[PDB]
């Protein structure tokens, strides 16, 4: 789809209609400890001053960290939802791509924590996100 | 378009083409110490599991806090960009609207800080965002 | 003690020997939704440049938010521990007192969230802390 | 005293009288991109439930990241103070040492950002702190 982990036969919202598909997020790699994703910059990713929207970096980090957790825990009967997202912005991006790498740093019974680095086409660190993902028994 | 502050005669990217116009953010009240905005929930705002995307709350807080700062500082020769966005998620929203209220709590010379509450249609506090906005002289 | 909630007959560490008692934190008010505490500035609260240590504000917020949660949940068989502490620093404090007010904004089954405001003797907002407190069944 | 960088001929407050000297923080390595420090756990570091206080991890990260910045910028006429400290807690520490490693990830002209890991004696990641340090010209 955007290559999200295939863990269920039906999803409530089709990729192309979600925020993820609308702005164009695509997952490249995914393992239990490390996942990567990326997006082309288009105006849909921008704010009116022409820079990538701060919310775009937050949303990229959120889907990558959450879905990399879903990829492990869904078959174990658990759901995984974002609980906290702290993104800090170091350098703006005006065009090209934004590439995210999520590295898992803690995997607890109720919380997984991911460090996400957001880089521009020159490899420069433009933002980071500390993602905290709540993991709970799936409700009937 | 989304009732963002009119502080310039032209902008790099038109409202309807930005992330904010694409998902449908609209500013209601705007003062130097407080601002509100809301968005109707549609699939464009959701992730594939059918909930409002964590990134959408981050983005709504981000735009509102930044533009509320812009409204004040632009005519003083400053720009205002997000430097830190920490959003915590308390309850999911499945449909209706998300309504954001931003309250200014510190206005320094280099950093303004806003507390943003994001509520659902029943008035419940579903997410909060602590927004730090860097204020710097405009380069042109 | 520092007037911490009296919820158990024995505690592993006496007040006066903990970090709290060593720097002098004292709780003034406590209810399920709102708690206050304060400390005299002494060198023990300072760093070597003579300002209150950033860690002092974090530690004040942490004990106040956590113990205001303990005050409700301990008798229900639960423990409460800090899970995240985000403190932002707006104005330094060189002497006098630091006064903290914690307002509960969410009380979930597994997480309570407290906004803490840290004010100087003139009432000025010097720092804030967003405290996330994990609440778990007490282990035998 | 705690092996903090020697960048001035005198300081307002002596090491042994500061928070850092009182709880016993000691800097081991210090470079412009990386620094380490450690502390022996004693009751002075703990809270009443017998665990290292959340505030102590915050303070150790705070001092290390700030002073690591100080080591570089002081001789350039700048001061460096904590602007934001976000510490997340993964595992409690009851005794032994806490060992902090600070890695610089962004060095802007107004803000330096450090990732701090806090590990226990077995090497386990017990807490992390994202430290944003404001760099500003010294007023004298
Ligand atoms: C926050 C949380 C409970 C969340 O759990 P998680 O992310 O699902 O991690 P998980 O549940 O897999 O457990 C990790 C470790 O946490 C501990 N833990 C987790 N749940 C429990 C529990 N129900 N009972 C006892 N220990 C637990 C235990 O050490 C566990 O390891 P293990 O024995 O299971 O191998 C766990 O990450 C944690 O315990 N983190 C540390 C909390 C901490 O140390 N905070 C700072 C101290 S408490 C706050 C404070 O400063 C304070 C100061 C003054 C004052 O008067 C009161 C409070
Ligand atoms: C971070 C910042 C500098 C950013 O400024 P801002 O948000 O734009 O606010 P603004 O610049 O308008 O100034 C607000 C107040 O900050 C102070 N300030 C700002 N710039 C300066 C400066 N260049 N020189 C001295 N003070 C300044 C000043 O008190 C100012 O009030 P005023 O005298 O200008 O009315 C300001 O918010 C601030 O100073 N916050 C407090 C920082 C703080 O106290 N952090 C904790 C202590 S430092 C870190 C630490 O714990 C540590 C521990 C051990 C150790 O060995 C080393 C460090
Ligand atoms: C995070 C947490 C589960 C923690 O729970 P808590 O602080 O203990 O709160 P509590 O458990 O009392 O429940 C509050 C509400 O959360 C929901 N909830 C809590 N636990 C569960 C559960 N096990 N199953 C279903 N719903 C639950 C439920 O709505 C609950 O209300 P109620 O039905 O019990 O009245 C709860 O606060 C929460 O659900 N918060 C919202 C999480 C959220 O909406 N995050 C953003 C969306 S998920 C992340 C994301 O953006 C994403 C994007 C793309 C993608 O592909 C994947 C993910
Ligand atoms: C926040 C800050 C200005 C602080 O500076 P710093 O950490 O000291 O780094 P420094 O000042 O060294 O500059 C780093 C880069 O930032 C940019 N920058 C810094 N100061 C300026 C300035 N005065 N004017 C223009 N660009 C600047 C510049 O690109 C710089 O690289 P260089 O050209 O100087 O090599 C810089 O880190 C930065 O720009 N970060 C990125 C900010 C960002 O992109 N936030 C997200 C977008 S803005 C918020 C938003 O989403 C929004 C959405 C809707 C809406 O309607 C309004 C806003």
Q: Is C89 part of any known ligand binding site?
A: yes
**Cβ within 8 Å, pair B128-C108:** no
Whether A124 has its CB under 8 Å from any CB of chain D: the answer is: no
Q: Which of C40, A68, C55, C119 is nearest to D87 (CA)?
A: C55
DSSP letters of A64-120?
Answer: HHHHHHHHHHTTTTEEEEEEEEEEEE-S---SSEEEEEEEEEEE-SSEEEEEEEEE-
Torsion B42-B47-B51-B56 (CA) sign: negative
Residue bearing tokens 């957001």: A118
- Selecting among B16, B62, B67, B95, the annotated active-site residue is B62
Cβ(B134)–Cβ(B111) below 8 Å? yes
The protein residue whose alpha carbon is closest to atom 54 in ligand 1 is: C63
Helix (H, G, I), strand (E, B) or coil at D110: coil
Query: Looking up tokens 């990326």, which residue turns up?
Result: A38
Q: Is B83 on the interface with D (CB under 8 A)?
A: yes
How far are the Cα atoms of A97, B75, B118, D15, D54 from residue B28, in angstroms, in the given order?
Answer: 32, 21, 14, 52, 40
Note the ligand closest to the C-alpha atom of B18: 4
Q: Strand pairing partners for D38?
A: D26, D99
Q: For residues C21 and C28, what is the distance between their CA atoms, to the nearest angstrom?
A: 14
Q: Where are the alpha helices (DSSP H) in C7-138?
A: 19-23, 54-73
> What DSSP designation does D122 have?
T
In the reported structure, the alpha carbon of residue B26 is separated from the centroid of ligand 3 by a whole-number distance in angstroms of 26
Of D62, D75, D95, D101, catalytic:
D62
**Rounded to an integer, what distance in angstroms lies between the CA atom of residue B18 and that of residue B38?**
16
Closest CA to A52 of D110, D105, B82: B82
CA dist., res. B62 & res. B60, Å (int): 5
* Shortest CA gap D18–chain A (Å): 30
CB atoms within 10 A of CB A22: 19
Sheet with C78-89, edge to edge strand ranges: C26-31, C34-40, C97-107, C111-119, C125-137, C78-89, D78-89, D125-137, D111-119, D97-107, D34-40, D26-30
The span from the CA of C119 to the CA of C96, in Å, is 11
Backbone angles phi, psi at B64, to 5 degrees: -65, -45
A99: its two tokens? 């590439």
List the one residue out of A36, A37, A43, A33 whose CA is nearest residue A20: A37
Question: From ligand 3's centre to the CA of D101, what distance in Å?
Answer: 33
Q: Which method was it determined by? A: X-ray
Contact D33, D104 (CB under 8 A): yes
Q: How far apart are CA D45 and CA A53, in angstroms?
A: 42
Q: Do A134 and C86 touch (CB under 8 A)?
A: no
Q: Is B18 helix (H, G, I), strand (E, B) or coil?
A: coil
Q: Could you tell me the resolution of this structure in angstroms?
A: 1.8
Domain count of the fold of chain A: 1
Q: What is the maximum alpha-carbon separation in chain A?
A: 46
Calpha distance D56→D74 (Å, rounded):
25
Q: Which residues of C touch A85 (CB under 8 A)?
A: none
* Pick from A18, A124, A97, A110: nearest CA to A63: A18
Q: Are D132 and B84 within 8 A, CB to CB? A: yes
For the annotated catalytic residues of C, the residue numbers are 62
Å between B134 CA and nearest CA of chain D: 10
Q: Are A50 and B58 in contact (CB under 8 A)?
A: no
> D93-108: string of b/e by CB count within 10 Å (b at 16+)?
beeebbbbbbebbbbe
Q: What sign results for the dihedral spanned by CA atoms B90, B92, B95, B98?
A: positive
Question: Which letter, b or e, does each residue of C60-74 get, where b requires 16 or more Cβ atoms within 10 Å of its Cβ?
Answer: bbbbbbbbbbbbbbb
Q: Which ligand is nearest to the CA of C70?
A: 1
Find, among C115, A103, C124, the residue nearest to B86 by Cα.
Answer: C115
DSSP state of D43: G
Q: Is there a binding annotation on residue C25?
A: no
CB-based contact A132 C86, cutoff 8 Å: no
Phi then psi dihedrals of residue A15, to 5 deg? -45, -50
Determine contact, residues C75/C94, Cβ cutoff 8 Å.
no
Cα separation, C76 vs C79, in Å, equals 9
Mutation site for D-interface testing, chosen from B87, B111, B136 by largest number of D Cβ within 10 Å: B111
Range of the domain at B66: 1-140
Based on the number of CB atoms within 10 Å of its own CB, is A45 exposed (0-12), middle (13-18) or buried (19 or more)?
buried
List the chains bordering chain A where 3 or more Cβ pairs fall under 8 Å: B, C, D
CATH number at residue B136: 3.10.129.10
Ligand 4 site residues, Cβ closer than 6 angstroms: A 47-48, 51, 53-55, 89-92; B 4, 20, 62-63, 66-67, 79, 81-83, 134, 136-137, 139; D 108-111
- How far is the C-alpha of D11 from the C-alpha of D13, rounded, in Å? 6
CB contact under 8 A, C134 and A110: yes
3 state SS of A23: helix
Contact D66 CB / ligand 2 (< 6 Å):
yes
Q: C82 CA to middle of ligand 1, Å? A: 8
Write out chain A residues lying below 8 Å of B81, CB-based: 51, 54, 89, 92
Residue D19 parent element (H or E): helix D19-23
Contact B48, A11 (CB under 8 A): yes
For residue C89, which of B127, B108, D35 has the smallest C-alpha distance?
B108
| D44 phi and psi angles, rounded to 5 deg | -55, -30
Cα separation, C101 vs C30, whole angstroms:
10
Of D14, D62, D89, the CB nearest to C54: D62
């Amino acid at each position: 789809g955007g290559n999200l982990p295939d863990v269920a036969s039906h999803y409530p919202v089709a990729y192309e209609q979600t925020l993820d598909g609308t702005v164009g997020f695509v997952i490249d790699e995914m393992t239990p400890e490390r996942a990567t994703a990326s997006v082309e910059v288009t105006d849909t990713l921008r704010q009116r001053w022409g820079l990538v929207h701060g919310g775009a970096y937050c949303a990229l980090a959120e889907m990558l960290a959450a879905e990399a957790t879903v990829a492990v825990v869904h078959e174990k009967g658990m759901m995984a939802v974002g609980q906290s997202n702290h993104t800090s912005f170091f350098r703006p991006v005006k065009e090209g791509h934004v590439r995210a790498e999520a590295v898992r740093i803690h995997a607890g019974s109720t919380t997984w924590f991911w460090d996400v680095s957001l880089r521009d086409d020159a490899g420069r660190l433009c933002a980071v996100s500390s993602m905290s993902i709540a993991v709970r028994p799936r409700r009937d």
